[PDB]
């Protein structure tokens, strides 16, 4: 919000867990203690489109994201062209 879908979980470990999703998610930002110690929910999200490939894999244990962003550029949908 403008890209606000929560995939968070609690492990935020990313080995045999989740990577998939065009650019958007440059994480591994180890918070001072959470097991395989890499955490949060995103990096700078003003770049790419609206997947839920975002979970599909590696837990969000609650929801999982999808489209919810509304304010929606174009670069933010393939088609501005």
């Amino acid at each position: 919000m403008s890209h606000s879908v929560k995939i968070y979980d609690t492990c935020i470990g990313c080995t045999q867990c989740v990577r998939a999703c065009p650019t958007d998610v440059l994480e591994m930002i180890p918070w001072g203690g959470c097991k395989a110690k890499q955490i949060a929910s995103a990096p700078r999200t003003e770049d790419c489109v609206g997947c839920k490939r975002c979970e599909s894999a590696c837990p969000t244990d609650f929801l999982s994201v999808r489209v919810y962003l509304w304010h929606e550029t174009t670069r933010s949908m393939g088609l501005a062209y």
């Binding site: 065009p22 489109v49 609206g50 997947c51 490939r53 999808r66 489209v67 949908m77 393939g78 088609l79």
Partner: protein, 730 residues
Amino acid sequence: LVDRDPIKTSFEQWAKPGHFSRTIAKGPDTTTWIWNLHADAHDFDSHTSDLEEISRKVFSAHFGQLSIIFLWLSGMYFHGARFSNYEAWLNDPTHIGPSAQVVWPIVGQEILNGDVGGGFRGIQITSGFFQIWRASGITSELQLYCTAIGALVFAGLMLFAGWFHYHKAAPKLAWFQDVESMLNHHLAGLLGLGSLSWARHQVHVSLPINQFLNAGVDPKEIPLPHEFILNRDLLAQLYPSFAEGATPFFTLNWSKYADFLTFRGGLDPLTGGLWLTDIAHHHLAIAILFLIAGHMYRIKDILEAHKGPFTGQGHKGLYEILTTSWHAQLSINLAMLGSLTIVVAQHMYSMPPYPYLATDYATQLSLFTHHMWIGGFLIVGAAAHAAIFMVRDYDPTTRYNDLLDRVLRHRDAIISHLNWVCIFLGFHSFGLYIHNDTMSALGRPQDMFSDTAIQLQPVFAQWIQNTHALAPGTTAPGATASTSLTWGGGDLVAVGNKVALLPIPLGTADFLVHHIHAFTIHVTVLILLKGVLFARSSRLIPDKANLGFRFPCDGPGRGGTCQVSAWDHVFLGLFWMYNSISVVIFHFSWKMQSDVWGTINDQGVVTHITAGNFAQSSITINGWLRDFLWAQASQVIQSYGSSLSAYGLFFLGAHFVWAFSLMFLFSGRGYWQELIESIVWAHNKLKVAPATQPRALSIVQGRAVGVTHYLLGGIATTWAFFLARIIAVG
């Protein structure tokens, strides 16, 4: 998998949860995998990453079709035998109105069983045995009862060849992965040696045993079970024992003959099923070719050859992987097999090949729409399976820079055109009709599009029809009539019960249906074409060959990102074709009865099932339920308490089942979840649910239970609508 490879048990795998990708069906319980298992049961991305077997399965689990087609046919020959009406009907055609099936009078049943001919209670037929069966250079009920077990023979045996494969330790690669000869064989001697062999048992025996049937008798007052050997003495009436000729060639004299054949064209006055004196010659004249033809050839060579400038460099090399595909060499086939079935559906109705058809109206249109839905249900397929290629089949990318890599090169292109094609059509191809309404309901005919208001004038004629029925005066030899009696020029006299075929006139109300077909055939194909083409990669998703050719929809983003894929292009392309065929049917009978079917009496004042109501009145697309749907169908909704009744009595269900599809077609998915729990809750209180985690439908399963229903609904609806307006007047 696992227990217990490999050398160490016979002991078969009955017991231990799962199999089919690898954090498989998991210990942990669920339901989805029970539609999994049946769906995709046949598939190949699992079983093994290695060709080999698969062709070793498909050449077996193939087999069990033939065997089946073979258990089938038997119960039809048996059926078309001792549940008789065939004996009765043949001494007595023009008269009967055939049966093979009959109930047993349990519960309500019996109403379904209603006097059909040679004196008995039963349910009719629109499946023209009793008419291949004319054939029987012999006749006899118990006889078909041999042809019948002759059937179950081929089966058990042509079904133990399927034990005698996969399960037996199998052939391998070379065997098919040398293709070198295959069609060499197939077309030469079977394609040939059948049509050939069929010749020998198509004048030997059949011709004579209806040469002197087309008159009277009661069978066995004709055609013994052996009689037709060496005895080349009854073959005396139907030409010479060659008299002084020896193995054709020329040093032959005709001061008065020219062997059987003596080519016909037209229609027996007394049995207008087209002449048989021909039917040998044409099958003979086939086989030869095949006989000569199946003698290529060994492979590339011929395709590794003709290229050009813009043409197909990759033409040359058009697939090593056409010995290494299937999914490819199936999809090609379906387009042909399929597209080569509904070409039947014409040459049939405008050229009957069996004794007593046309007169028999309902027993060859059933046909022309059954054959019609395969020459379509097999074509969307013939696309699906190419999509299945286009996505996956080969190992890597070894196939390169060719005819395809070409076509794709353009792709936002071949489908860029085709599109506008359709909106050009549609506007010229349907709103065309809507004019009429809006202006005939406005009402000013001066200006409609009538076969008479917009300028066309009491003639259609001068085109090519009129240079077909009239061509027996070219290089043409001849033989009274044409080729297909439905052509412009000459002749009338066809049949002495009811009618058969005659000219079939055109202009507009023939002009524009013929065009709606265009636009209907075209936008069908758009969606399959662009569908299979954009199979694997795109500028809505490029990371888009990453699972399979199904996948639900990539995800809420990009705007939509739902339908995409190509399971689904082969989901909304069925959706059309159901129309493609469903309106082509709607076409034929409204013609074929508005004109043609109808009837002679004195001065042969013709009296169609309908005095051509078509005229000025299909052009209005209401006329299509004024004159069609509300007109005919009055036989469906009158049909209660009768004999056929099973149609009206279907026509409510299946005219229900369709109106149940929309629920499967039109709805969400975590919906019936959100619901399936409220349920799952009430379940747990009594202690009655959890085990086998009950789950809603697999996004695309959901679409699977659309579509399939929408068709078996929306279709048998007319299968009923029909048989109910040809049985009984017409």
